[PDB]
Design a protein around this nucleic acid. Structure first.
Ligand SMILES: Nc1ncnc2c1ncn2[C@@H]1O[C@H](COP(=O)(O)OP(=O)(O)OP(O)(O)=S)[C@@H](O)[C@H]1O
Ligand SMILES: Nc1ncnc2c1ncn2[C@@H]1O[C@H](COP(=O)(O)OP(=O)(O)O)[C@@H](O)[C@H]1O
Ligand SMILES: [Mg+2]
Ligand SMILES: [Mg+2]
Ligand SMILES: [Zn+2]
Lengths: 193, 637, 438, 172, 200
DNA sequence: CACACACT
DNA sequence: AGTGTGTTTTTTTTT
């Protein structure tokens, strides 16, 4: 058909992955795209290739995520971990979440997808041991789910608010939440004259 | 007791919330007082539904379920003090005042979350009040329990009351004590035990089993015992579907005394209140309700002559034809008057009909229809039951410890319509036993050490196949059936069913079956599997509480047995005797000399026909109709 | 060592929390599952345990009897850590462990006097199942005169049972702590009996049977007459013959040797896919003849006979009329003909096809109570109702042999039962009626 | 609600008890007896899609509906006792839709309140069940049986999203 | 009772849509249930006949519109219910048609027996319209382009079935049975559409 | 659980 | 004076 029903209801995890790929990211080159004053330019409409024309091996460079992953598949790219990804930041966020059962922590919504992709490919470049990072992010996911559950006790027909919930979790939750919410709205409207 | 007192206060707030309850208690007390002035004193039993009080206090209603052993005790204490502060008639029966009359709490409706079934009952839900409806095979006899001991030495002027609630009635699990009645009391005082003023509660160990059909295939019914102590004593007979509201409790220390140590734990359901519902498909416990609207109904039709035929048509609507047979079974259903005489000779008003039919003549279903139509409905086949077992089993029971009377069908038979199928196959010893005990309607049961005679008066329908596959007219009827005329004459009606087949009638049967088959059951999806579910009946206890509808018809006819008591009327008497003139000495050899039995049979038949008319006495129309139907049956037409 | 035991508990929780494959911690997955549906039970594979840490597995093997309660406590603490907010007895029921071994199975026969209190792997067919028996997870007591009330949490991991408390324990007596059976928390147990490996067929040896016990998330999983591959510790307790005690098994995991799924509660293990191709076969009329031909291999024809067999096995629909009546669904097919014509062979094949009922023979079946026999129980002199063949056949399409050879009189009692689709018994003063859907 | 919705039509088709406040000739075919006309004060189940209009049409409505056992007081009692326990599908495969139509016809807040409460409780339980993922459970299937078909659809979609996620992050 | 026939029809249609929906993969369109359709056709004709009898009914003696016109309006209700049931069934059919067109003719029940003529040319012209959308503008993108986000252009693929050489844009490629081939994503996708490739 | 014996 | 220990034929069912 024009569009499968499941697709129009919610964004697929692969679509989330694509969106995250559209994000920029800090990396290190292993190629000096700069040409000595003493070829072929990338010429991208979606992203300024001037930076892409300007990489030098092992220098500060920011690029969009998907090209970074593409080049990281090759030996020519080195990825930079985010600051929140650092184990100390993870521990602080865990402590915050334990401290504040009411609400969530200001995580970068795409953090789940970022963690997935980096674990898939950037396993090498993690300064911190990767397995502990996996465990910590798993625990954060669990805690966020539990905090959701208490929110489910407080589902309302009027207003639902989510301050710091990640894009992945809100996407996977949207179908059921919207169904329940709109059903409550319809019930109330029928109650009203 | 601070939490206990708080729960007492909350229960008082409940009583304040629902006046009707205190009003019912008020009506109970005045009922107690006037009857005391006059019997039948209802106990201090008070019934409050789970759906009741659920509204004003979610917390209290929940905690009743979660911790009944902590909620009901204070609730009943508050109930009692409210009643005694509100009965306002303390002086009469001052002797029983000291003995004290506990006020009891009951419930209505289905817990659902708590009330599921005996089989579904597991230890995971224990010490919480639940309800299950089940069949009870075992009932223990009553034994009073002396919880409040009255004992007193004349010199003291004290009248000590040492009250002991060891295991059963207690909910706090008070320590066991023997109640020795020390002959020194405290100050060397004789301490005479004063009989009376002492509480006694007749204990019952009653074990309840699940449905055979609800039990999955290959699974024996699950059984659990319940306790009844001079509060709920003996509404129900063994083998009856009954809903009990009980708490899941454990005793015997789980058997973990000192070491074997893997033995199971002793648990049991103690039931505060019980709702007996033994009616088929969860009806009205075979107790048809009555309203003045329903009372005035039907009657106007009873004036019309066709009402009898309408009732006949209503019976076995799934069967085609057999209109005279349906009239006969209708006459069966209505019960005749048991004429009594100032001697051992008591005339029987029971209706007994024997029928012989080809296989698959629907008579089996007919017997089944009589079953599901009758209240008691004691039915089986010739091979279905052991004759001695159904009549009386004089074997001992190990728990009882001595010789026991066990009448499988007989004691169940009396005071209710009963059925028997394939009596030709029935054990001949059972046949000779039923002979003359169904004539005299009483069994001496003098067999073995027990000699007590128990009455067995009931209405019985017999459906035995011919000795040959089908009745052959060339063969004699007694050649066609080997059952001797002994007590075969003692059948108020005799019937022969022959599956002869005619194009018109064959088409009629076929069309009837076609209508019955393609018909989707009431409601449901057309492409929906059969459900025959439990019906999830929330209503429990007082919550449960020209064509004519069938259960409505049954209620009407039961009301008739309750009310219509016709007496043999003189013009009907003359019609009867005028028939009998030639009936006993009929020139036509209809076989089975009618003798004196058939006169009484026709008497009963005319009486029940008058009962159809609802007349307070018999009429000659009843007599002539009965005679016409009898000659119809005897000619075989 | 109690601190050391707590350290071992911590090591086990480190196992479960940090054992993953492909970033997937299956243990927390099943944990959250058992949180969503509140089954306080956990399944673990010892191969995984060895892979993560041999030492913990070895400590397990040394004396599982007391290692298991520590593991249960660890799982309970883990559940408290995960599924309960931080700083937010009997508040959370303890989770119980489930294990799959995949090691060798010593036969029930030839079990040694050794292996006492040792985890073992076996297989056998159930001959009997016990009713549920609660077990005091938590015990509530009070010191009688001293009035001191205390808590006890006894595990079913010793031997037999723990004796009742003695002395005041902060004279109050040799057992002041009278158990108040209200706060005390119980879990049901069920006893099992396995026949020794019907395939083993020890020639001339009567099949030995051992007793078992099951926990609340193990009980009632399987029925008698069904073979199960069991993984439970070898267990010994005193029945009440010197220094000889009852041998039994405390089960840590249950697996079906017959491998047949449990009572089908309409949960589609075939799922939408397999039933979709099932309907496609129903959609294609040729598949009807496919089923026809497939039945009775090597029969060489008789195809309409096989069609009739398929239709009978297919089950006639029982319609319940709004009237007290009810259309009879099942039918019973009659097999008359010359001997040596694979008739009994075909019956056996059909019964093998559909085990909802049981193949029998007339002489082999007891003449009295073919539908349901009445037997005197050893501990109750009353003759109880034992389920006969058509009790088992109820809910199943049943094949029985030698109808002609059978005595006719009781076969008369069969036609009525099948006609009514129930089995009505009032013999011996017992008026039980059981359904016969066969 | 969707006009082309299948459940819309199905719920509309269900017959409901209607008492005839009018005795109008010619409508006997509605009782499959076209020759016999309609008589006054007669109760009769009639399809909901007909029924709600027939209640609407009338001054005094020509035909009056009856309080369904579908909406009997014991129904609400069972709901309030335990929303989870009740097998809604056994009560109806379209109970929620029928309640919606009734409330649009009759704005009873208390019925709306209890319906909302039941829906909420089944919503938490459905979230629990959908979040549970195989790597099936009998209790989940039993719950599925206890649910209305539309509830089953919500569970299907939610569990489908869960499965998509779990297959996504846990494997390439 | 009249819509009851339509009720069975719509129950059948809901069964079909459940059957298709539960399987993410394509479900061959079930046989067109023209039996029930024609039954409803006669019912509506006879329904129209009874409406005419109501008009003639009045012209003669049923002049009590309160009664007669009420009866006619009721008939109208019945016929509208039947019509709406048929519309829902037909719309569901057409949704399946569009789905199958996109999945087979756009991505590349082949038999039309399950399908009636009218809807046969309906689906044919719908496919033509889809091509027209592909035609002219928007030709750059595939109107039936894969809705999955593209993971990696270069992937190795083993040949599912041997079909000889098939020309790509620039590289020769022989479909030798079970041969790995690591190339751009367009060609491998289009051959997956024919299924000649596999395993990703 | 709890009360007569046989020494404790 | 320690402390321990004991009491609740029949009838089917084969055959
Ligand atoms: N038509 C046939 N096709 C294949 N094998 C057949 C056929 N007829 C007979 N047999 C074989 O002959 C054997 C004899 O049948 P049995 O299984 O012993 O039972 P049965 O045919 O009921 O014999 P009776 O009547 O009990 S002595 C079958 O097991 C088949 O192996
Ligand atoms: N007149 C009839 N109308 C409808 N069904 C009939 C009739 N006669 C026999 N049957 C059918 O015959 C079947 C067997 O009847 P059953 O009660 O076993 O016969 P019998 O009278 O020999 O005991 C049933 O399905 C019953 O409905
Ligand atoms: Mg019969
Ligand atoms: Mg044979
Ligand atoms: Zn003490």
């Amino acid at each position: 058909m024009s569009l499968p029903a499941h697709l129009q209801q919610t964004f697929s995890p692969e679509e989330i992955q694509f969106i995250v790929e559209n994000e920029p990211i800090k990396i290190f080159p292993r190629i000096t795209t700069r040409q000595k004053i003493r070829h072929t330019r990338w010429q991208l409409i979606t992203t300024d290739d001037k930076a892409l024309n300007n990489m030098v091996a092992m220098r500060s460079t920011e690029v969009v995520l998907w090209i970074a992953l593409l080049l990281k598949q090759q030996s020519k790219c080195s990825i930079v971990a985010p600051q929140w990804l650092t184990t100390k930041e993870l521990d602080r966020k865990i402590q915050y979440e334990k401290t504040h059962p009411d609400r969530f922590s200001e995580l970068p919504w795409n953090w789940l997808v970022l963690a997935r992709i980096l674990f898939n490919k950037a396993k090498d470049d993690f300064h911190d041991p990767i397995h502990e990072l996996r465990g910590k992010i798993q625990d954060l996911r669990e805690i966020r789910q539990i905090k959701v559950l208490k929110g489910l006790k407080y589902l309302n027909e009027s207003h639902l608010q989510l301050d710091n919930l990640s894009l992945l979790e809100i996407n996977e939750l949207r179908p059921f939440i919207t169904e329940i919410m709109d059903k409550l709205r319809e019930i109330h409207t029928a109650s009203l004259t | 007791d601070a939490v206990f007192g708080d729960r007492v206060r909350r229960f008082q707030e409940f009583l304040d919330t629902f006046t009707s309850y205190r009003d019912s208690v008020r009506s109970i007390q005045v009922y107690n007082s006037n009857n005391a002035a006059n019997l039948n004193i209802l106990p201090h039993r008070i019934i409050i539904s789970l759906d009741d009080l659920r509204e004003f206090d979610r917390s209290f209603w929940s905690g009743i379920l979660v911790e009944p052993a902590y909620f009901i005790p204070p609730a009943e204490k508050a109930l009692t003090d409210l009643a005694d502060s509100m009965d306002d008639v303390p002086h009469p029966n001052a002797s029983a005042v000291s003995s004290r009359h506990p006020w009891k709490l009951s419930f209505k409706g289905s817990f659902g979350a708590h009330a599921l079934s005996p089989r579904t009952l597991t230890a995971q839900h224990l010490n919480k009040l639940v309800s299950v409806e089940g069949i009870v095979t075992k009932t223990s006899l009553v034994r009073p329990k002396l919880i409040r001991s009255v004992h007193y030495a004349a010199k003291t002027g004290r009248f000590h009351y040492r009250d002991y609630t060891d295991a059963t009635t207690t909910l706090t699990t008070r320590i066991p004590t023997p109640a020795i009645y020390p002959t020194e009391d405290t100050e060397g005082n004789k301490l005479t035990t004063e009989y009376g003023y002492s509480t006694f509660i007749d204990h019952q160990r009653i074990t309840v089993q699940e449905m055979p059909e609800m039990a999955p295939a290959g699974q024996l019914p699950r059984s659990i015992d319940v306790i009844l102590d001079d509060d709920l004593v003996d509404k129900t007979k063994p083998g009856d579907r009954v809903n009990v509201v009980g708490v899941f409790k454990s005793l015997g220390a789980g058997g973990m005394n000192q070491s074997n140590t893997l033995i199971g734990f002793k648990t049991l359901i103690l039931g505060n209140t019980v709702y007996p519902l033994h009616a088929r498909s969860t009806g009205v416990a075979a107790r048809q309700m009555l309203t003045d609207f329903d009372i005035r109904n039907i009657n106007k039709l009873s004036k019309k002559k066709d009402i009898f035929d309408i009732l006949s048509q209503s019976l076995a609507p799934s069967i085609y034809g057999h209109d005279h047979i349906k009239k006969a079974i209708l006459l069966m259903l209505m019960g005749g008057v048991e004429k009594n005489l100032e001697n051992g000779s008591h005339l029987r008003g029971d209706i007994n009909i024997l029928m012989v039919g080809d296989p698959s003549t629907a008579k089996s279903q007919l017997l089944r229809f009589v079953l599901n139509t009758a209240s008691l409905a004691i039915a089986t086949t010739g091979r279905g039951s052991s004759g001695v077992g159904l009549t009386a089993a004089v074997t001992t029971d190990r728990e009882t410890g001595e010789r026991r009377l066990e009448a499988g069908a007989m004691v169940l038979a009396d005071r209710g319509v009963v059925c028997i199928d394939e009596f030709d196959k029935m054990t001949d010893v059972d046949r000779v036993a039923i002979h003359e005990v169904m004539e005299q309607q009483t069994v001496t049961i003098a067999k073995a050490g027990i000699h007590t005679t128990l009455n067995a008066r009931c209405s019985v329908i017999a459906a035995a196949n011919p000795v040959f596959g089908q009745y052959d007219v060339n063969r004699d009827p007694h050649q066609n059936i080997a059952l001797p005329d002994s007590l075969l004459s003692r059948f108020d009606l005799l019937f022969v069913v022959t599956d002869d087949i005619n194009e018109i009638r064959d088409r009629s049967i076929s069309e009837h079956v076609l209508r019955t088959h393609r018909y989707l059951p009431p409601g449901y999806l057309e492409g929906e599997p059969v459900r025959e579910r439990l019906n999830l009946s929330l209503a429990v206890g007082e919550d449960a509480d020209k064509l004519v509808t069938i259960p409505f018809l049954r209620k009407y006819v039961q009301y008739a047995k309750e009310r219509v008591i016709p007496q043999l009327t003189q013009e009907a008497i003359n019609v009867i005797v005028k028939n009998y003139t030639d009936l006993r000495n009929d020139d036509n050899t209809k076989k089975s000399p009618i003798t004196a039995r058939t006169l009484e049979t026709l008497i009963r038949l005319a009486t029940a026909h008058a009962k159809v008319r609802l007349s307070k006495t018999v009429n000659k129309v009843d007599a002539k109709v009965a005679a016409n139907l009898l000659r119809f049956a005897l000619l075989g037409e | 060592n109690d601190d050391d035991n707590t350290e071992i508990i911590k090591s086990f929780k480190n196992f479960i929390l940090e054992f993953r494959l492909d970033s997937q911690f299956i243990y927390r997955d099943q944990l959250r599952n058992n949180i969503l549906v509140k089954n306080y039970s956990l399944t673990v594979n010892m191969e995984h345990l060895i892979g993560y840490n041999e030492d913990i597995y070895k400590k397990l093997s040394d004396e599982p009897s007391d290692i298991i309660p520590l593991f249960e406590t660890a799982i309970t603490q883990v559940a408290k850590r995960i599924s309960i907010l931080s700083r937010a007895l009997n508040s959370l029921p303890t989770f119980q462990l489930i294990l799959n071994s995949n090691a060798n199975q010593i036969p029930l026969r030839d079990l040694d006097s050794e292996h006492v209190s040792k985890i073992v792997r076996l297989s056998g067919i159930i001959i009997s199942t016990s009713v549920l028996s609660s077990r005091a997870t938590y015990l509530s007591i009070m010191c009688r005169n001293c009035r001191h009330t205390t808590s006890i949490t006894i595990n079913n991991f010793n031997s037999n049972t723990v004796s009742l408390p003695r002395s005041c324990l902060s004279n109050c007596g040799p057992d002041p702590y009278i158990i108040i059976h209200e706060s005390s928390k119980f879990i049901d147990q069920q006893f099992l009996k396995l026949q020794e490996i019907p395939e083993l067929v020890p020639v001339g040896e009567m099949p030995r049977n051992l007793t078992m016990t099951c926990d609340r998330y193990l009980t009632n999983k399987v029925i008698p007459g069904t073979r199960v591959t069991i993984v439970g510790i070898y267990s010994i307790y005193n029945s009440k013959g010197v220094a000889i005690r009852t041998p039994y098994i405390k089960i840590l995991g249950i697996q079906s040797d017959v491998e047949t799924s449990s009572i089908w509660n309409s949960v589609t293990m075939f799922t939408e896919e397999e039933e979709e191709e099932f309907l496609q076969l129903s959609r294609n009329p040729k598949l009807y003849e496919i089923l026809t031909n497939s039945i009775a291999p090597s029969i060489f024809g008789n195809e309409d006979i096989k069609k009739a067999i398929v239709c009978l096995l297919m089950g006639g629909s029982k319609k319940i009329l709004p009237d007290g009546m009810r259309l009879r669904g099942d039918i019973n097919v009659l097999l008359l003909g010359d001997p040596g014509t694979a008739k009994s062979q075909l019956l056996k094949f059909v019964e093998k096809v559909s085990p909802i009922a049981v193949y029998t023979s007339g002489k082999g079946s007891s003449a009295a109570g073919l539908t349901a026999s009445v037997q005197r129980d050893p501990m109750t002199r009353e003759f109880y109702l034992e389920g006969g063949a058509m009790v088992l056949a109820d809910g199943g399409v049943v094949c029985i042999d030698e109808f002609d050879k059978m005595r006719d009189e009781d076969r008369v009692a069969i036609h009525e039962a099948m006609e009514q689709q129930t089995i009505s018994i009032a013999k011996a003063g017992i008026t039980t009626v059981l359904n016969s859907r066969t | 609600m969707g006009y082309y919705d299948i459940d819309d039509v199905l719920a509309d088709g269900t017959e409901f008890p209607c008492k005839f406040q009018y005795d109008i000739p010619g409508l006997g075919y509605l009782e499959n007896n076209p020759g016999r006309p309609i008589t006054k004060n007669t109760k009769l189940s009639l399809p909901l899609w007909l029924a709600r209009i027939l209640a609407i049409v009338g001054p005094v409505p020509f035909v009056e509906l009856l309080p369904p056992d579908m909406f009997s007081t014991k129904v609400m009692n069972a709901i309030k006792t335990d929303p989870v326990a009740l097998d809604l599908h056994s009560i109806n495969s379209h109970f929620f839709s029928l309640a919606i139509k009734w409330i649009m016809l009759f704005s009873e807040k208390e019925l709306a309140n209890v319906v909302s409460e039941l829906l909420l409780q089944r919503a938490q339980e459905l979230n629990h069940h959908a979040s549970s993922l195989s790597i099936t459970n009998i209790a989940t299937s039993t719950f599925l049986l206890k649910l209305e078909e539309m509830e089953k659809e919500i569970y299907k979609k939610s569990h489908e999203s869960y499965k998509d996620t779990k297959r996504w992050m846990f494997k390439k | 009772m009249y819509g009851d026939l339509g009720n069975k029809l719509v129950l059948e249609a809901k069964r079909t849509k459940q059957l298709y929906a539960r399987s993410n993969q394509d479900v061959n369109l079930p046989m067109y249930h023209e039996d029930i359709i024609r039954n409803i056709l006669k019912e509506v004709s006879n329904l129209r006949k009874n409406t005419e009898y109501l008009k003639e009914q009045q012209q003669l003696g049923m002049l009590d519109d309160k009664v007669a016109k009420c009866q006619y309006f009721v008939t109208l209700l019945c016929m509208e219910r039947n019509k709406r049931c048929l519309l829902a069934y037909q719309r569901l059919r057409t949704d399946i048609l569009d789905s199958m067109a996109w999945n087979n003719n756009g991505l590349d029940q082949q038999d039309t027996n399950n399908l009636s003529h009218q809807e046969q040319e309906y689906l044919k012209e719908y496919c033509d319209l889809i091509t027209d959308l592909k035609s002219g503008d928007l030709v750059d993108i595939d109107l039936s382009g894969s809705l999955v986000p593209p993971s990696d252009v270069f992937i190795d693929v083993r040949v599912l079935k041997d079909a000889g050489e098939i020309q790509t844009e620039y590289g020769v490629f022989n479909l030798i049975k079970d041969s790995q081939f690591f190339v751009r994503q367009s060609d491998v996708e289009r051959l997956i559409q024919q299924g000649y490739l596999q395993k990703i």
